[PDB]
Enzyme design. Structure first.
Site, PDB file in Angstrom:
ATOM      1  N   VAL A   1      -7.024  11.966   1.069  1.00 48.22           N
ATOM      2  CA  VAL A   1      -5.807  12.495   0.457  1.00 48.22           C
ATOM      3  C   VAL A   1      -5.160  11.473  -0.474  1.00 48.22           C
ATOM      4  CG1 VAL A   1      -5.279  14.250   2.189  1.00 48.22           C
ATOM      5  CG2 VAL A   1      -4.562  11.889   2.562  1.00 48.22           C
ATOM      6  N   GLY A   2      -5.807  10.327  -0.677  1.00 47.34           N
ATOM      7  CA  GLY A   2      -5.296   9.354  -1.636  1.00 47.34           C
ATOM      8  C   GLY A   2      -5.396   7.886  -1.260  1.00 47.34           C
TER       9      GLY A   2
ATOM     10  N   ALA B   1      -3.744   1.579  -3.497  1.00 48.00           N
ATOM     11  CA  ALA B   1      -2.922   0.399  -3.744  1.00 48.00           C
ATOM     12  C   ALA B   1      -3.145  -0.650  -2.657  1.00 48.00           C
ATOM     13  CB  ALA B   1      -1.450   0.782  -3.824  1.00 48.00           C
ATOM     14  N   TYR B   2      -2.586  -0.399  -1.475  1.00 49.17           N
ATOM     15  CA  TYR B   2      -2.778  -1.267  -0.323  1.00 49.17           C
ATOM     16  C   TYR B   2      -3.667  -0.635   0.744  1.00 49.17           C
ATOM     17  N   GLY B   3      -4.272   0.516   0.461  1.00 45.61           N
ATOM     18  CA  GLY B   3      -5.166   1.148   1.416  1.00 45.61           C
ATOM     19  C   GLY B   3      -5.523   2.562   1.008  1.00 45.61           C
ATOM     20  N   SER B   4      -6.529   3.097   1.700  1.00 46.74           N
ATOM     21  CA  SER B   4      -6.987   4.475   1.558  1.00 46.74           C
ATOM     22  C   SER B   4      -6.446   5.312   2.713  1.00 46.74           C
ATOM     23  CB  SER B   4      -8.518   4.545   1.552  1.00 46.74           C
ATOM     24  OG  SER B   4      -9.080   3.614   0.640  1.00 46.74           O
ATOM     25  N   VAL B   5      -6.236   6.610   2.465  1.00 41.32           N
ATOM     26  CA  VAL B   5      -5.638   7.516   3.448  1.00 41.32           C
ATOM     27  C   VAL B   5      -6.486   8.777   3.595  1.00 41.32           C
ATOM     28  CG1 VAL B   5      -3.571   8.784   4.167  1.00 41.32           C
ATOM     29  CG2 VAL B   5      -3.344   6.670   2.856  1.00 41.32           C
TER      30      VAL B   5
ATOM     31  N   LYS C   1      -4.510   5.593   7.775  1.00 38.65           N
ATOM     32  CA  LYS C   1      -4.566   4.655   6.652  1.00 38.65           C
ATOM     33  C   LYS C   1      -5.434   3.452   7.004  1.00 38.65           C
ATOM     34  CE  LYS C   1      -0.968   2.040   5.383  1.00 38.65           C
ATOM     35  NZ  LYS C   1       0.429   1.861   4.871  1.00 38.65           N
TER      36      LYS C   1
ATOM     37  N   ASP D   1       8.040   4.669   3.998  1.00 45.62           N
ATOM     38  CA  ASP D   1       7.646   3.713   2.947  1.00 45.62           C
ATOM     39  C   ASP D   1       8.690   2.612   2.729  1.00 45.62           C
ATOM     40  OD1 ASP D   1       5.264   5.076   2.631  1.00 45.62           O
ATOM     41  OD2 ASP D   1       5.619   5.664   0.545  1.00 45.62           O
TER      42      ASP D   1
END
Ligand SMILES: Nc1ccccc1N1CCN(CCO)CC1
Ligand SMILES: [Cl-]
Ligand SMILES: [Cl-]
Ligand SMILES: [Cl-]
Ligand SMILES: [Cl-]
Ligand SMILES: [Mg+2]
Length: 346
Positions: free
Chosen positions: A26-27, A28-32, A47, A162
């Site tokens: 579903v999508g 900087a500092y990590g993948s999700v 994440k 966030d």
């Protein structure tokens, strides 16, 4: 220790406990990835952190994020459902995975698409302030409150997410960008050491936008945005000027022609007079004089929802690590200890 299984999804290897099924990117500092948690019935976001220990700066940021998420236990704040690593010892520890509730819509979708009554604005801003009272009671500053960091469900219930966990880059804050439109002027321009009052400025910017459907201060750059702000709230007097530490910033302010504070009833035409009153108490240039979260919950605008026996504060939060100087492998060991000591919520 649970059984893990491996798979490759969009060029990334994911190794996760069997309880998590039907992973979907579903999508900087990590993948999700979105997933179904068969142990709890929750729909979750998983994440995988990217390069969590590549530098001292990055290792300390990984520790900071995990400590903050483990502490937050409040209805209006994102909490941590699980944290895991496939490593069987510190010696092979390299990957960190974080699990939270999967969020759908944010406040951006609501403000742009829906017709909001005054009752909707009361309930939404009440919940932001209830969460902020909790956050500020632990001496935590969010620093990045804006509509995309506020999740909302079908019943108008809200969660803050966030948290500001690293410095934003210079490029990210440049130009006609929503990343800067909600920031208090003292942090936007580095006027002085800031504190938790910066979050109340952001709440005022969000509340104004819910009432009008329009961004309050959509500046094309830092200086254009400052001019929009000072036209509404007035130029500073000598008392606030004393508190700006940069001689150069003080000099620039004094180059501007003086302007009085505007009449907010003629800016927010037709709004509830109690909403106008609260906005005048949030959007104060001198941060020492802004209303606090605890004071705002008792304002008459929220009389329908305020319950001082149902507005909890946080357990104490030890942030002494922030002034500590450690090596990468020491930050990594501290993070490992926090992964293995995690206890899930009831
Ligand atoms: N309560 C809430 C408030 C604001 C935004 C979202 C939610 N839920 C969290 C719970 N979840 C179901 C179990 O995974 C659906 C979204
Ligand atoms: Cl499992
Ligand atoms: Cl949560
Ligand atoms: Cl690992
Ligand atoms: Cl936003
Ligand atoms: Mg965000």
């Amino acid at each position: 220790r649970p059984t893990f299984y491996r798979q490759e999804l969009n060029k990334t290897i994911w190794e996760v406990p069997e309880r998590y099924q039907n992973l979907s990117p579903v999508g900087a500092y990590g993948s999700v990835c979105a997933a179904f948690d068969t142990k709890t019935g929750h729909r979750v976001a998983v994440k995988k952190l990217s390069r969590p220990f590549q530098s001292i700066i990055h290792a300390k940021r990984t520790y900071r994020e995990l400590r903050l998420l483990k502490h937050m236990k409040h209805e209006n704040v994102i909490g941590l459902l699980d944290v895991f690593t496939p490593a069987r010892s510190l010696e092979e520890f390299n990957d960190v995975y974080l699990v939270t509730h999967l969020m759908g819509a944010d406040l951006n979708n609501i403000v742009k698409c829906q017709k909001l009554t005054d009752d909707h604005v009361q309930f939404l801003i009440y919940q932001i302030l209830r969460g902020l009272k909790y956050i500020h009671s632990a001496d935590i500053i969010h620093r990045d409150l804006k509509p995309s960091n506020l999740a909302v469900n079908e019943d108008c219930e809200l969660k803050i997410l966030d948290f500001g966990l690293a410095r934003h880059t210079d490029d990210e804050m440049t130009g006609y960008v929503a990343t800067r439109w909600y920031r208090a002027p003292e942090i936007m321009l580095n006027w002085m050491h800031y504190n938790q009052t910066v979050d109340i400025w952001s709440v005022g910017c969000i509340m104004a936008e819910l009432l009008t459907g329009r961004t309050l201060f959509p500046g094309t750059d830092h200086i254009d945005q400052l001019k929009l702000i000072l036209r509404l709230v007035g130029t500073p007097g000598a008392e606030l000027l004393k508190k700006i530490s940069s001689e150069s910033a003080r000099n620039y302010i004094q180059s501007l022609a003086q302007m009085p504070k505007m009449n907010f009833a003629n800016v927010f035409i037709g709004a509830n007079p109690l909403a106008v009153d609260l906005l005048e108490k949030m959007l104060v240039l001198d941060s020492d004089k802004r209303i606090t979260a605890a004071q705002a919950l008792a304002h008459a605008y929220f009389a329908q929802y305020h319950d001082p026996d149902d507005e909890p504060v946080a357990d104490p939060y030890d942030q002494s690590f922030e002034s500590r100087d450690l090596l990468i492998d020491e930050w990594k060991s501290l993070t490992y200890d926090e992964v293995i000591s995690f206890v899930p919520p009831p």
